[PDB]
């Protein structure tokens, strides 16, 4: 039951991409993918139950070593702890519904089976990454999910914008991966082994934490690395949902939680800055997908702050990930359903009424919005309040800035989420498309997401939920009031006169433009200078005419 | 200020494109079409206050000021229909252009499919 | 119309009739809207292969399982694995293979 959690999606994806798929068709490919996802999900549920509740960690010898030269020893070995069990359970539960939705959304796509196979590869490599006991397998999972994301974003190879976005994201993640590789070099040189269980550190040389955090921020799309995330909406809805729910974006935070070898000051500063930037970004746009992506970034920043707080903060951050994934995927899927009912319209300004879409999709979007904004007694409510309370008691004076920033960010989160729902349904109709699709499978996927959200409340992620921390009565009620304020302001749907601030905010602070010409055009010029001026010039040896 | 091609437009056409793009931008800054309606009425009325202008110097002044106002107000995220230029649904999956097929190439001219030297 | 076209299958009913896709391309996955005739029998055979490989990896997984500490309570892994050590509770009392308190302190 243990190795079923990893090998089964991989085998399913291999079959879906094998020449065997020629003899099956899209019907058969969908059947195979759904069956593989369900079986892996059952295995993951069993493993989660046993590990979390009965505390049984199991280590696996899989393929022997991978390579052992010198004191460096690398082995195909898998270990399942509480962290690995949580990650596997979350990823499988997300990706099962993601596959269910993708089996219906792209029904009129020509090459559906390739899409299914790449999704299965993405899920399997995520399972590989989380199953890692040593850092090399973590790297393998990192690059495998990167490759799968590259293929999935560039699925529609006929649109240049998607190709540009994929290449940009790949290069940014490769910068992060070089930083991570340098950190791995340092970790092995100063610790002599790669298994996380053999990594217990009290005070490193600083570069360890710095480089590891930079590499993690690369995957988590934090400050100075978030630009790629918005452009990823060029890909199909299932890819964005899977990436933003439980994979890729989660991997950096997962590595940080597994390691717990960071530096609190830099972690807190980066997380707070990224959260504030994501919050101000999400309320200032009109593309539906970009807002949800920026919300993903904001929750990533929340988790960063939590893990920077401490070990308890790290576990709370892991629980925040576990609760965030479900409703993030739910929001993505509901947005995709509404968009398809809107004739592919991906802009908010042409929506309205209760005629374009089904009742279940509307209710699912409502529930996901309520959970994400921290509505009292809900899934995101518990994790967000726990992180806030643990951040309202930190011993770092730096954290005081972070607490205020996160309060503002949560208020803005409620603001733009309520604006999203308001523009989706509450406003009058202002588009031209009504094709309400009421197919069983995506509705069932939404149902599974909502059931998992219910479980996350009826059953806590860890023992932290319910652990009461002693705050003044106003302090606890503060995020509730902030969400109420966001509700009021968004239901007013009002705006300001300071239009220069508006044009600045909408531009995403010009970060893409800044990176367009500070490093990039100079890289191009350095390349031309090197080649032409040196090789054909200074390094050139001409001909002796005669 | 407009672009050089728009600078070459006839006065009637220049003002027409000005008004059209202004309506486009007002949609782009609009929360909804319903919000856009009174803005559309006001924008139509404002031009109605300039219908009987004859002195070309003041006409050019008004046109240039409006062009500068519009240029200052180029929307960063325009509202586009999905299957047109710049739209998200544009250039997704086109029909395959005709491509000729070569049957059994290895079978032709065997033992002589290498490289000259 | 060329000679080899007669060996070629037509465009599938799933495919949009207004689309042309140069049907002669051998694709690794099947191509465009691929939907064979005996597809359900192929699907059943594929599921059979899936189940056989599932059984093989199930056997290997049960074979190569290493449990370094007694679990905290009853688990379903017992019913198919005997290498699983007998559980020990939070209070350190050893418990039977059924995960219940033994005699002397039970009931």
């Amino acid at each position: 039951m243990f190795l079923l959690s990893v090998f089964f999606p991989l085998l399913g994806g291999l079959v879906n991409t094998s020449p065997i798929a020629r003899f099956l068709g899209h019907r058969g490919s969908s059947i195979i993918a759904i069956g593989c996802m369900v079986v892996a999900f059952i295995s993951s549920v069993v493993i989660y139950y046993e590990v979390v509740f009965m505390g049984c960690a199991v280590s696996v010898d899989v393929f022997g070593t991978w390579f052992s030269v010198g004191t460096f020893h690398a082995g195909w070995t898998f270990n399942f702890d509480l962290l690995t069990a949580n990650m596997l359970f979350t990823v499988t539960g997300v990706s099962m519904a993601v596959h269910m939705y993708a089996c219906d959304y792209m029904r009129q796509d020509p090459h559906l089976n390739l899409f299914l196979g790449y999704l299965s590869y993405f899920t399997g490599f995520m399972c590989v990454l989380v199953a890692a006991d040593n850092l090399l397998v973590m790297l393998v999972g990192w690059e495998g999910i990167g490759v799968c994301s590259y293929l999935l974003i560039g699925y529609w190879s006929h649109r240049l914008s998607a190709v540009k976005s994929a290449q940009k994201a790949i290069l940014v993640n490769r910068v992060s991966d070089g930083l991570l590789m340098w950190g791995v070099l340092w970790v092995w040189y100063h610790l002599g082994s790669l298994e996380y269980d053999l990594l217990n550190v009290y005070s490193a040389s600083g570069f360890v934490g710095l480089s590891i955090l930079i590499g993690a921020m690369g995957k988590s799309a934090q400050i100075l690395f978030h630009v790629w995330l918005a452009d990823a909406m060029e890909g199909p809805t299932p890819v964005s949902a899977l990436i933003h729910a439980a994979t890729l974006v989660t991997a950096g935070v997962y590595l940080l939680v597994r390691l717990h070898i960071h530096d609190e000051m830099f972690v807190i500063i980066v997380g707070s800055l990224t959260a504030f930037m994501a919050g101000v970004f999400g309320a200032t746009q009109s593309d539906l997908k970009r807002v949800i992506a920026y919300s993903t970034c904001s929750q990533l920043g929340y988790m960063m702050v939590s893990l920077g707080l401490g070990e308890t903060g790290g576990e709370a951050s892991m629980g925040h990930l576990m609760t965030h994934a479900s409703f993030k995927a739910a929001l993505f899927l509901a947005a995709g359903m509404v968009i398809s009912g809107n004739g592919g319209n991906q802009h908010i300004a042409r929506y309205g009424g209760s005629a374009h879409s089904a009742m279940f999709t509307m209710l699912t979007l409502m529930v996901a919005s309520l959970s994400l904004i921290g509505w009292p007694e809900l899934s995101g409510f518990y994790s967000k309040e726990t992180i806030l309370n643990l951040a309202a008691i930190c011993a770092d004076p730096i954290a005081d800035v972070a607490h205020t920033l996160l309060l503002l960010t949560a208020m803005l989160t409620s603001a733009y989420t309520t604006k999203l729902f308001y523009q989706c349904f509450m406003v009058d109709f202002s588009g031209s498309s009504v094709t309400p699709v009421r197919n069983v499978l995506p509705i069932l996927a939404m149902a599974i997401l909502l059931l998992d959200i219910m479980l996350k409340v009826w059953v806590g992620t860890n023992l932290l939920s319910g652990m009461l921390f002693f705050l003044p009565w106003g302090v606890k009620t503060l995020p509730f009031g902030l969400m109420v304020a966001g509700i009021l302001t968004a239901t007013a749907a009002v705006g300001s006169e300071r239009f220069t601030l508006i044009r600045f905010c909408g531009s995403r602070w010009g970060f893409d433009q800044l990176f367009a010409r500070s490093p990039v055009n100079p890289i191009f010029d350095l390349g031309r200078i090197t080649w032409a001026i040196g090789d054909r010039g200074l390094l050139s040896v001409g001909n002796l005419r005669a | 200020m407009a672009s050089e091609v728009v600078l070459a437009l006839p006065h009637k056409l220049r003002v027409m494109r000005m008004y059209r793009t202004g309506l486009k931008e007002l949609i782009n800054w609009s929360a909804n079409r319903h919000e856009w309606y009174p803005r559309a009425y006001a924008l139509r009325q404002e031009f109605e206050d300039s219908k009987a202008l004859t002195d070309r110097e003041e006409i050019r002044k008004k046109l240039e000021h409006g062009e500068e106002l519009l240029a200052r107000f180029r929307h960063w995220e325009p509202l586009i229909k999905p299957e047109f230029v710049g739209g998200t649904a544009y250039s997704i999956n086109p029909a395959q252009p005709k491509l000729k097929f070569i049957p059994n190439y290895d079978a032709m001219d065997e033992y002589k499919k290498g490289d000259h030297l | 119309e060329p000679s080899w076209a007669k060996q070629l299958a037509p465009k599938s009913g799933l495919c949009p009739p207004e689309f042309h896709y140069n049907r002669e391309i051998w694709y690794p996955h099947g191509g465009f809207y691929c939907d064979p005739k005996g597809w359900r029998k192929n699907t059943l055979l594929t599921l059979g292969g899936i189940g056989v490989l599932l059984y093989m990896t199930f056997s290997y997984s049960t074979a190569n399982e290493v449990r370094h500490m007694p679990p905290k309570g009853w688990i379903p892994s017992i019913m198919w694995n005997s290498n699983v050590p007998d559980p020990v509770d939070f209070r350190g009392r050893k418990l039977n293979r059924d995960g219940t308190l033994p005699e002397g302190e039970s009931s």
Partner: peptide
């Protein structure tokens, strides 16, 4: 959906593409 159901008869017989571009001739083995 063909036949109006997800469990309908198939629609494809013949050769789906030419592997390597090798085309059968008069039923003679390649």
């Amino acid at each position: 959906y063909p036949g109006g159901s997800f469990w309908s008869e198939g629609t494809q017989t013949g050769k789906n593409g030419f592997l390597f571009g090798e085309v059968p001739i008069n039923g003679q083995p390649r």
